[PDB]
Design a protein around this ligand. Structure first.
Ligand code: HEM
Ligand SMILES: [Xe]
Ligand SMILES: [Xe]
Length: 188
């Protein structure tokens, strides 16, 4: 996982569950409880999973509920630390640019495996968005969508059309409906 983002997860974990739960979880994979992850670092996915396992053991919540909660809250953390991704955007634009953002922010990394998040309009008031990634982080993806709706104060309905593995990649396709029209037909 890219260091920058893992750093957001640590703050978000503090904001959700408190410093003692977080310090002890980090200590438990042998990190400095106060480690600051730089953009010069990448973090092994499995260390992150062990950190979240410890958070689940200490809070009594299942680890998927933790990811879902972290996805929701991490939007606010992103809006504080990387505000230029939010500045003067609406929810629909923010969502449709995510796939590109995720490529741009990992293109400097040798052998990068960003999640793909391709979105396409399927109706005047709805898009489809498909998460595709080896990492299987379905709750984090859903929680980020939920968090995005909260941050932008735009209500959506989220239908999970399908979820499963295909050719070694986890995939989750959702249909996101907005309260008003957001697309119109135009000459292609
Ligand atoms: C300012 C907003 C955001 C930024 C800067 C950002 C950036 C990143 C970066 C750099 C990674 C690491 C990828 C890697 O190391 O391979 C990541 C992980 C991830 N991103 Fe975001 N992200 C943002 C918002 C979102 C949103 C809205 C979604 C979903 C709609 C999303 C979905 C995910 C997921 C599910 C992961 C976990 C990695 C995986 O599933 O393979 N992100 N993000
Ligand atoms: Xe973490
Ligand atoms: Xe992870």
């Amino acid at each position: 996982m890219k260091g920058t983002i893992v750093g957001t997860w640590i703050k978000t974990l503090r904001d959700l569950y408190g410093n003692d739960v977080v310090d002890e979880s980090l200590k438990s994979v042998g990190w400095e409880p106060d480690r600051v992850i730089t953009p010069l670092e990448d973090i092994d996915d499995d260390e992150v999973r062990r950190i979240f396992a410890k958070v689940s053991e200490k809070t009594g919540k299942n680890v998927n509920e933790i990811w879902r909660e972290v996805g929701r809250q991490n939007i606010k953390t992103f809006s504080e630390w990387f505000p230029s991704y939010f500045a003067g955007r609406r929810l629909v634009n923010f969502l449709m640019m995510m796939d590109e953002v995720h490529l741009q922010l990992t293109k400097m990394i040798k052998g990068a495996t960003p999640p793909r998040l391709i979105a396409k309009p399927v109706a005047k008031d709805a898009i489809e968005m498909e998460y595709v990634s080896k990492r299987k982080m379905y709750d984090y993806f859903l929680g980020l969508i939920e968090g995005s709706s909260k941050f932008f104060k735009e209500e959506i309905s989220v239908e999970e059309v399908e979820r499963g593995e295909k050719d070694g990649f986890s995939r989750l396709k959702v249909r996101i409906k907005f309260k008003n029209p957001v697309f119109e037909y135009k000459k292609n």
